[PDB]
Amino acid sequence: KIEEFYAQFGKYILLVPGKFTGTVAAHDLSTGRTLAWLAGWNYGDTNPIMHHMAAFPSPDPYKGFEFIVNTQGGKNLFIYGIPTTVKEPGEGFNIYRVRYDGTKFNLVSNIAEKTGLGLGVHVTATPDGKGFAVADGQKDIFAEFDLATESVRTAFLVDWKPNNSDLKRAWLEGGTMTITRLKPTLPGGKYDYTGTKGCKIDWELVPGGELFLEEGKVTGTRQTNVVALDAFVYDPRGRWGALSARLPGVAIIFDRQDWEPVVALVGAKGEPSSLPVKKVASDTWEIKMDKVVTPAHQAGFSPDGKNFLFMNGVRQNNIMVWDTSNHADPTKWTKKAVVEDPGWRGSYPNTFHMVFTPDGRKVYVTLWWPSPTPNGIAVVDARNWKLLKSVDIGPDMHTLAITYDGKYVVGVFSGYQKTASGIVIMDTKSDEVVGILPSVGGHHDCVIVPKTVEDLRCSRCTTT
Amino acid sequence: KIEEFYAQFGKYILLVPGKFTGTVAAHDLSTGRTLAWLAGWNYGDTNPIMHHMAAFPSPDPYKGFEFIVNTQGGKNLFIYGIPTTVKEPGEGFNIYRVRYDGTKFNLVSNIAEKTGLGLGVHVTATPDGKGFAVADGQKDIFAEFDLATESVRTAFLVDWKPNNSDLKRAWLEGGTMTITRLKPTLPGGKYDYTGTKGCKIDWELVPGGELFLEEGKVTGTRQTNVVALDAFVYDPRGRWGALSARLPGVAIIFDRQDWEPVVALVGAKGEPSSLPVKKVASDTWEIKMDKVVTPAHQAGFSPDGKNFLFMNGVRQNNIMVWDTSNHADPTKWTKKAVVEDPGWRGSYPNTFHMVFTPDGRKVYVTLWWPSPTPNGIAVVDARNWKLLKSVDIGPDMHTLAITYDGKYVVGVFSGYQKTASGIVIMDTKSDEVVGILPSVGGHHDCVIVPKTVEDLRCSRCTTT
Ligand SMILES: [Cu+2]
Ligand SMILES: [Cu+2]
Ligand SMILES: [Cu+2]
Ligand SMILES: [Cu+2]
Ligand SMILES: [Cu+2]
Ligand SMILES: [Cu+2]
């Protein structure tokens, strides 16, 4: 009897982007009703690949809330096996502000249009809930934005110059990563990165697909210069952000106060904790890497700020953990644990998206595989850094959120945009699935609308 | 754990079109997983208002099944209060054959492109599961199609010549309804009715729309000639179909054996059971009406074929019942009962989608209202023809299906394409809602995949 079922979850609203569905929706977990949804194409967005999102604190989400959801475009339509005859896909890379008003969603604005930065990968809210970052893995640009004035606080380009320009070897044998503070180049303080402009490669490196670039499977004009920026995740204590770069397996720490990169964490087990960042011009820094052992993808801080996690993938499948307890000095942050399992020894599964419990005692980590292996959730003890349980969910598992009273993990799986998809709920006490709800969605994201800034510590702010 | 909850629904697959979401999806009600979905826009359908659908018998739906789903287009995008700036929307009126193969959907063909008939209103499967009809109330055309060969069996235009050419009086004061058997006009045996071609009005009439048409609130080139065809529903005993025409409030019975109209049933309480059809040329019939007392919309046979129902709307809100137990002679079909309620005295609710229990003992009927009145489900005794109970569900209630063991009615509500939406499940023993599943959809339809031709008797075949 279902009232009893939902009544246990509490008054929390799940938001999900639909990827190839083109939708965003909000669902009330306390009743199982969908409160509202919006279809990008209704508005003239002809390629609404609704990708990542974050929501800002609201005193009463059921009366109103805001979020940012972005899109990808161009040939991103062509990489998930849908046999479409579309010849010229919409450019995409939109960044939309959407407000729920208690009845419906309202499309407030297109921040990519206003600012000129079209960025299609992770969206993250800043810890005070008053700005957000968006990163892009085809352009290798990220920016932090002020929500009130819809403007750019900072924007950076990250470039790779490979030691070996052979595409198979362009990362393995190392390189120089250059970080450049960008300045607007169009009148009105606008950037020139609308739609597909700035792309080094012609579609994103897909879930699990970091190496397709080196293997010669991705077209583009600047293939060996890619780093595949993914996310800028936030230290919940403030001041610092971590920019994940998937191909070199590096999280670059930035000082948000002066907007400079300070240190570069190196993912791979058996490599150093970090490499220095050297300033080479007023607006340009470099990191030198002799080699890249493995790519890395998902990244995040623990709620208290004292641990940072980076998921090595493909060449190694592990969770790398740094002690980040020294808030004053990121060059003191040192690897302190690595979560490994014999069953992660192949190419897959990849340790993937994460969410921590509010008390910081456990981290849930998705386990991604290509079809047809069931994808699932790893439950990790975040005090001793040991894997506790793996639970199978279904195909193409993506993000996890958690109810902010810490009782229930809520995840989405997304069927590779063509098979089974769902919203899964896991009880954090028993670490068992309490159920599956249907979901028309290929979501690579999901969030529970936060009420407070403290909620963001366990939302799309600290972690992907 | 919802496990227990879904186990009781049994192994049934629910299909739903998205309306303004642009998707179709199948949900396994035994597990809560969405088996597969498809997004019209991915395929270059720029205005995929996914509208009506029917599914065919499959001996194991979990291993595979097929269905037809159609779309609307043109200005139908502009009538649900979505503040879109789109100036020239996609033409639409597609008719897609979709096959689930056990893992995903395959968009098999575009039967509208293949045949040239673009029809955007109800889709209904024939009782043998080998064909399907599609009607359209902007064009006033319907056709029955052979599924195997994806070809037209028959197609008809219905036209209104009003007694009074004043648009406000064009139906009230009666007229002559002309039925024409159509012939292809293009090479290849194609029709010339793709996209918006053949439209007499520029959108489908909304609930209560007949007054908005009379009042001059709907644009179009042939406003006084519209009958607003809705559906061709099937006698489960075979041989006959009923074509509903909303504005005259008539269901025209056709002999599927020779493809000729045989009698016209008249909806309104206090009018004759029916009027004669006269053949006036090889391919043309007429029905004469001295007056039209009220419009009517939803229409359907009981599972045994012995009752036909037609929902008077707007000027009367009732369920008109005919004794249709004479299978040999529709001209003998006579009004036997009318379901009325003091609460039906206003403009709304409109009685408008239905589903019968397998044993024929009850019929569930949706109660539609404009926002913000809660919409709901009426439960009618289909032996004594009395209203038993009304239950409130949500905003914008649409269709009802029933699991084929007769245990659960499954309905969808759709938030006027902007607010709350969901799938509701009602236990047919207590006639109480057992609960609500989230649903990103503005669905005007839903069906449960049939196993047998007997299942179609309670599916999108005998009723809308
Ligand atoms: Cu990512
Ligand atoms: Cu993901
Ligand atoms: Cu993604
Ligand atoms: Cu209808
Ligand atoms: Cu409906
Ligand atoms: Cu509709």
Closest residue on chain B to A39 (Cα): B21
Task: Count CA atoms closer than 13 A to A275's CA, side-chain side.
Answer: 23
Encoded amino acid at A44, one letter? G
Residues linked to residue B23 through DSSP beta bridges, in sequence order: B39
The Cα A397–Cα A393 span in angstroms is 7
Q: List % helix, strand, coil for chain A (3-state, nearest 5).
A: 10, 45, 45
DSSP for B310-333, written as a single string = EEE-TT--EEEEEE---SS-GGG-
Q: What six digits make up the tokens of A444? A: 């690579």
| Cα dist from B134 to B155, B201, B378, whole Å | 10, 18, 27
* Pair type for strands A307-312 and A362-368: unpaired
Contact in structure between B315 and B294 (CB atoms under 8 Å): yes
The Cα B130–Cα B109 span in angstroms is 16
Closest residue on chain B to A24 (Cα): B440
Nearest CA-CA partner of A408 in A3, A124, A6, A102: A6
- Please report residues of B whose CB lies closer than 8 A to that of A423: 438
Q: Tell me the domain boundaries of chain B.
A: 2-456
DSSP for A83-148, written as a single string = ----SS------EEEEEE-SS-EEEEEEHHHHHSB---S-EEE-TTSSEEEEEETTTTEEEEEETT
Smallest CA–CA distance, residue B142 to chain A, in Å, is 28
B104 and A20: CB-CB below 8 Å?
Answer: no
Q: What six digits make up the tokens of A96? A: 């939309």
Q: What six digits make up the tokens of B280? A: 């006036």
The Cα A227–Cα A200 span in angstroms is 10
Residues found in chain B? 464
Contact in structure between A58 and A67 (CB atoms under 8 Å): no
- Interior/surface letters A372-383, b for 16+ CB within 10 angstroms, e for the rest: eeebbbbbbebe
Find where tokens 């920019």 sit.
A243
Nearest CA-CA partner of A424 in A29, A56, A61, A50: A29
Query: What ligand has the least distance to the C-alpha of B17?
Result: 6
**Entry resolution (Å):** 2.0
The Cα A106–Cα A94 span in angstroms is 16
The Cα A311–Cα A352 span in angstroms is 7
Taking CA A393 as the corner, what is the angle to CA A392 and CA A397, rounded to the nearest 5 degrees? 110
B186 CB-contact burial (10 Å; exposed 0-12 / middle 13-18 / buried 19+): exposed
DSSP 3-state of A260: strand
Contact in structure between A58 and A449 (CB atoms under 8 Å): yes
Count of C-beta atoms within a 10 Å radius of residue B223: 16
Residue from the list A23, A34, A85 with its beta carbon closest to the beta carbon of B438 = A34
B391, B395, B399, B404: CA torsion to nearest 10: -50
Q: List % helix, strand, coil for chain B (3-state, nearest 5).
A: 10, 45, 45
Residues of A at the annotated binding site? 19, 51, 122, 204, 230, 297-298, 327, 353, 398, 444
The Cα B338–Cα A325 span in angstroms is 76
Nearest CA-CA partner of B319 in B331, B330, B303, B335: B335
Count of C-beta atoms within a 10 Å radius of residue B167: 15
Find where tokens 């100036």 sit.
B87
* Ion ligand 6: residues, CB < 5 A: B 444
DSSP 3-state of B74: helix
| Cα dist from A392 to A214, A349, A374, whole Å | 31, 12, 6
Contact in structure between A310 and A267 (CB atoms under 8 Å): yes
Query: What ligand has the least distance to the C-alpha of B244?
Result: 4
A166 CB contacts (<8 Å, ≥6 apart)? Answer: none
* Three-state secondary structure readout of A269-332: CCCCCEEECEEEECCEEEEEECCCCCCEEEEEECCCCCEEEEEECCCCCEEEEEECCCCCCHHH
| Cα dist from A170 to A247, A250, A279, B88, whole Å | 10, 15, 23, 47
Encoded amino acid at B312, one letter? N
Q: What six digits make up the tokens of B227? A: 């009958």
The Cα B147–Cα B122 span in angstroms is 16
The Cα A95–Cα B427 span in angstroms is 44
Q: What is the DSSP letter of B456?
A: H
Cα–ligand 4 centroid distance for B263 (angstroms): 21
A5 and B3: CB-CB below 8 Å?
Answer: no
Contact in structure between B111 and A69 (CB atoms under 8 Å): no
Residues linked to residue B301 through DSSP beta bridges, in sequence order: B308
Q: What six digits make up the tokens of B182? A: 């159509």
Residue A74 has phi, psi (to 5 degrees) of 50, -135
Residue B362, phi-psi category: left (phi > 0), alpha (psi -120 to 50), beta (remainder): beta
Count of C-beta atoms within a 10 Å radius of residue A172: 17
Chain A to chain B Cβ contacts (< 8 Å): 174
Closest residue on chain B to A415 (Cα): B36
Nearest CA-CA partner of A271 in A242, A251, A291: A291
Q: What is the DSSP letter of A203?
A: S
Nearest CA-CA partner of B341 in B296, B386, B306: B386
| Cα dist from A67 to A91, A124, A411, A429, whole Å | 22, 10, 19, 30
Smallest CA–CA distance, residue A166 to chain B, in Å, is 35
The Cα A346–Cα A348 span in angstroms is 5
Q: What six digits make up the tokens of A67? A: 């979020």
Whether the bond between A372 and the residue before it is cis, its omega within 30 degrees of 0, is: yes
Q: Which helix H or strand E contains B380, and what residues bound it?
A: strand B375-381
- Please report residues of B whose CB lies closer than 8 A to that of A86: 42-44
Rounded CA Rg of chain A: 20
Nearest CA-CA partner of A310 in A250, A368, A378: A250
Contact in structure between A220 and A199 (CB atoms under 8 Å): yes
Task: Give the strand order in the sheet containing B123-125.
Answer: B123-125, B131-136, B141-146, B151-162, B175-181, B284-289, B278-281
Q: Is B235 annotated as a binding residue?
A: no
Nearest CA-CA partner of B55 in B115, B12, B103, B6: B12
Q: Is B63 annotated as a binding residue?
A: no
Encoded amino acid at A183, one letter? K
Where does A147-283 show beta strands of DSSP type E?
151-162, 175-181, 229-234, 240-245, 250-255, 260-266, 274-276, 278-281
Alpha helix segments (H runs only) across B226-317? none
Nearest CA-CA partner of A315 in A366, A364, A245, A268: A268
Residue from the list B1, B22, B42 with its beta carbon closest to the beta carbon of A82 = B42
Q: What six digits make up the tokens of A210? A: 């970091």
Just give the CATH number of A2-456.
2.130.10.10
* Ion ligand 2: residues, CB < 5 A: A 398, 444
Nearest CA-CA partner of A291 in A272, A311, A310, A318: A272
Cα–ligand 1 centroid distance for A65 (angstroms): 24
Q: Is B353 annotated as a binding residue?
A: yes
The Cα A80–Cα A78 span in angstroms is 6
Nearest CA-CA partner of B396 in B363, B366, B431: B366
Residue A92 has phi, psi (to 5 degrees) of 70, -145
| Cα dist from B192 to A9, A327, B88, B373, whole Å | 54, 71, 21, 42
User: How far, rounded to the nearest angstrom, does the alpha carbon of residue B397 sit from its chain's CA centroid?
Assistant: 14
The Cα A204–Cα B36 span in angstroms is 24
Whether the bond between A303 and the residue before it is cis, its omega within 30 degrees of 0, is: no
Count of C-beta atoms within a 10 Å radius of residue A45: 23
Q: How far apart are the first and last CA of chain A?
A: 34
Contact in structure between B91 and B426 (CB atoms under 8 Å): no
The Cα B143–Cα B241 span in angstroms is 11
Task: Count CA atoms closer than 13 A to B202's CA, side-chain side.
Answer: 12
The Cα A319–Cα A314 span in angstroms is 12
| Cα dist from B423 to B25, B29, B404, B413, B434, whole Å | 13, 11, 17, 7, 11
Rounded CA Rg of chain B: 20
User: How far, rounded to the nearest angstrom, does the alpha carbon of residue B287 sit from its chain's CA centroid?
Assistant: 23
DSSP 3-state of A68: strand
The Cα B207–Cα B221 span in angstroms is 21
A7 CB-contact burial (10 Å; exposed 0-12 / middle 13-18 / buried 19+): exposed
Closest residue on chain B to A102 (Cα): B419
Residue from the list B2, B86, B419 with its beta carbon closest to the beta carbon of A44 = B86
Contact in structure between B10 and B403 (CB atoms under 8 Å): yes
B5 and A6: CB-CB below 8 Å?
Answer: no
DSSP for B90-152, written as a single string = -----EEEEEE-SSSEEEEEEHHHHHSB---S-EEE-TTSSEEEEEETTTTEEEEEETTTTEE
